[PDB]
Amino acid sequence: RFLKVKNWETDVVLTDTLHLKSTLETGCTEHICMGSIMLPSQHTRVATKDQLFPLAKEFLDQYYSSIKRFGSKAHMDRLEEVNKEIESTSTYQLKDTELIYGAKHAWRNASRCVGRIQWSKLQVFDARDCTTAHGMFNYICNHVKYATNKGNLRSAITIFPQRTDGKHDFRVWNSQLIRYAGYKQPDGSTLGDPANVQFTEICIQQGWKAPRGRFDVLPLLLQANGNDPELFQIPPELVLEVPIRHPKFDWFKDLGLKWYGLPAVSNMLLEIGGLEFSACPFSGWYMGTEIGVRDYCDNSRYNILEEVAKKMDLDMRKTSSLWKDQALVEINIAVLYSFQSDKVTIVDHHSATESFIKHMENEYRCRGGCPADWVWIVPPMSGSITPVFHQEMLNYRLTPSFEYQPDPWNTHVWKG
Amino acid sequence: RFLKVKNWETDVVLTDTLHLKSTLETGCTEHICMGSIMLPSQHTRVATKDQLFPLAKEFLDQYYSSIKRFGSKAHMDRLEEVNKEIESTSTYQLKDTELIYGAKHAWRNASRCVGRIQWSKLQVFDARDCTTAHGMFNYICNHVKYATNKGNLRSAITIFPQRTDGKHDFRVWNSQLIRYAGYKQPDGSTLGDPANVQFTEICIQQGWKAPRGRFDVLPLLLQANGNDPELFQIPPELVLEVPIRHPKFDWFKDLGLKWYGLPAVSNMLLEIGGLEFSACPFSGWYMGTEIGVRDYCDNSRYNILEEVAKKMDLDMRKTSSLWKDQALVEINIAVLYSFQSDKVTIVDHHSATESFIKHMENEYRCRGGCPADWVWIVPPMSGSITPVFHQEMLNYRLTPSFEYQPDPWNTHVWKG
């Protein structure tokens, strides 16, 4: 009931009581651990009025506890107010302050996110008066511009109107506001980004004129108030890009690679007080490995280890020459170097993982715990030479939270 | 009840029914996942006669099912026999065949072991007639010699008499039959292997004449039938060692490093049919990263990244030059190269992880599943460029099994 997690490198012991406030479920039982299932059903999302108030009260109490008026008149009257409103409409509306708190704490509670030492420095844009896809494009363009901020990136979330009936949902159909296109070839190979080949097709179906190349920024596909979604091109001047060069190998420019500065995830669902925001795109900045190892080296992604190893003159015959490992370290030094030489915010896996340990200590102290998903916190390269490898982590689902949700094209009831 | 695990690189789906035969517990609940706690209490070990028969029957049934005589006369009479013997002595004795099956299947069930594609090629040495520490030394020397086999390593386990009352326990007090000594310094630094500094002290207390250097093979500390443990020196001619050179950097020999060929874990507890074998040392061969990344580069181990980076002329000022990563790939190419150039069995993390995927497929097919601990299966470097990174794994505890147990010097009731 008062659990202990240890670091097996520093011998530090932290005690976790926060897990007791845990609400959601994990997928694990006492007979089976599912800590490596990607999308557990407890991580995915018509909610009634009988369920809604406990959720609303649960949220309202931790908000008023947080600002040092738990049970004050303000708390009880707002408790009374929201209760009355859930009667009138079997739903309710977050105060602007409650919206910002909820958003920041969904981030704070994201157990797979190594970047949460920044969780309270988040810019919340209230887009809940938005009614049209054109409104959404506008809000999203102003998110991109503010967050990019000339390479000195700033975290930000834009929160569109909450779900209501279920039909009238706002959804951004992109997985990220900025993503490169994926076109497959006649021979069956893939041009661009194999991850988005299905989405690229959907855009082409709605009428995208594809400039079938490599690093082609996809258009936005915006669904407002349940209607069929609509194509919009982000002004290219808002899309900041970094050309990838190496600080020692001048042939690295010849590879002619570039990635985008602003990672901005748009397919997730934000939950606050039992209210569901189906469109809530959020941006921060990149940890280096996300692009260098995953984006660039996943076999089912760009898969360049092949080529980079060629230009390094690497013994590619035997697996045990570790040539894949050696091409991977170089590709990640060049991602970092390229981004920094342009003053575009990026963080390396060593600095990020040390900050998360530092953040974890703060959380156990001032908050009693910190949910953490080891399988996701540990970088996809150089695992054990980063401090998180040797940190025991307890994982559990607190709310407010970010959740997965189906892709709109598996769920949307069409009419056009 | 029929769970699905997916590979997110090949899109392969395997279905798991074996988890239904799961007996032990995991530490996870539906409110908390503990898949990154090192030693969960369900992984650690006076068992009565009322508990003993179900366990004995459970084991006996899967053994007779395995050899295609489930319920045959042989099965029922052996069921009757063992029941009768658990009456007479509230314990019982494994047939030589049941001992070999149990041992091979404890390995087969080890969910943290990436090497299990070999699980049925295991040499079981029955040391259950052993009565003295001198007997144990002899059995262990013959294990070392057989398993090493001139560098062409062979898997093997030596099984000492089962626990009985609790006092009269056989224990090898070494964590591994072969380990380098750890002496700390006047200035407080550490000479040799910081992991074994406490054990080295214990050997010095029982009267080891320490040759306080770097790679000093520790003596064996053997406890037989509950008595105080006793020091024995493995004949140095039985301890095969590999000098670590690099295939490109000739200064790498100057580093003057060597590791031992034979990894052989001796502090674990083998469980078969409710019987407990407190001493059961087992050996296979190394995956490269165990020495190159963990042994050599853990901060609380040998911690040579410092030095290797110096000789590479690496920018050690900024964390984000990835110099630690770059020194780590080289150190692992040299471990592999050194071991292979001497025909000493070793496996690289790429070849090992691909075999485990291949093994996992066989197990789901012919057995209905394969317990796997992602946190441990994924190598401590180059994670996502190995296929196990993207393999969803279900973890659960099947028996026969290998379990942890306290260090004998926290439990042993002394008299000498």
Ligand code: HEM
């Ligand atoms: C500020 C800089 C940030 C950094 C450096 C960072 C870093 C990371 C990384 C490396 C991951 C691993 C996910 C993957 O590899 O695909 C992750 C996951 C995640 N981050 Fe953070 N992040 C940042 C900001 C944010 C913000 C602003 C939010 C929300 C407001 C957020 C919420 C999440 C969530 C919900 C996940 C993973 C959940 C899942 O996929 O199931 N992050 N982050």
Ligand code: HEM
């Ligand atoms: C034959 C070659 C083998 C290879 C290449 C291999 C590889 C590995 C590796 C890399 C680990 C990770 C543990 C660590 O990093 O400390 C591991 C764990 C383990 N192996 Fe295997 N192993 C082999 C043979 C065996 C044998 C012969 C047995 C028993 C009969 C065994 C049982 C285990 C167990 C019980 C664990 C981990 C359990 C724990 O620490 O909680 N292995 N193995």
Ligand SMILES: N=C(Nc1cccc(CCNCc2cccc(NC(=N)c3cncs3)c2)c1)c1cncs1
């Ligand atoms: N389908 C595949 N994986 C896969 C499937 C479903 C989901 C996922 C997880 C994708 N999370 C993206 C993500 C989420 C949160 C943060 C980040 N990062 C960042 N810095 C930021 C992005 N915004 C603000 S911060 C990135 C991966 C594969 C294909 N091929 C090999 S795996």
Ligand SMILES: N=C(Nc1cccc(CCNCc2cccc(NC(=N)c3cncs3)c2)c1)c1cncs1
């Ligand atoms: N105390 C620390 N860790 C730690 C603590 C307790 C336990 C452990 C796990 C040790 N498993 C050793 C082990 C088990 C099984 C297989 C192998 N490998 C092999 N190939 C083989 C060895 N025999 C046959 S095959 C290695 C690690 C640390 C100190 N500093 C940073 S972590």
Ligand SMILES: C[C@H](O)[C@H](O)[C@H]1CNc2nc(N)[nH]c(=O)c2N1
């Ligand atoms: C805290 C965490 O559980 C610990 O570092 C684990 C992680 N995974 C591991 N995996 C292996 N193979 N060996 C280990 O020692 C560890 N250590």
Ligand SMILES: C[C@H](O)[C@H](O)[C@H]1CNc2nc(N)[nH]c(=O)c2N1
């Ligand atoms: C199957 C496994 O759960 C999958 O590869 C996970 C592992 N850990 C990860 N960690 C991060 N940061 N991102 C990922 O996509 C994944 N993928």
Ligand SMILES: [Zn+2]
């Ligand atoms: Zn779990």
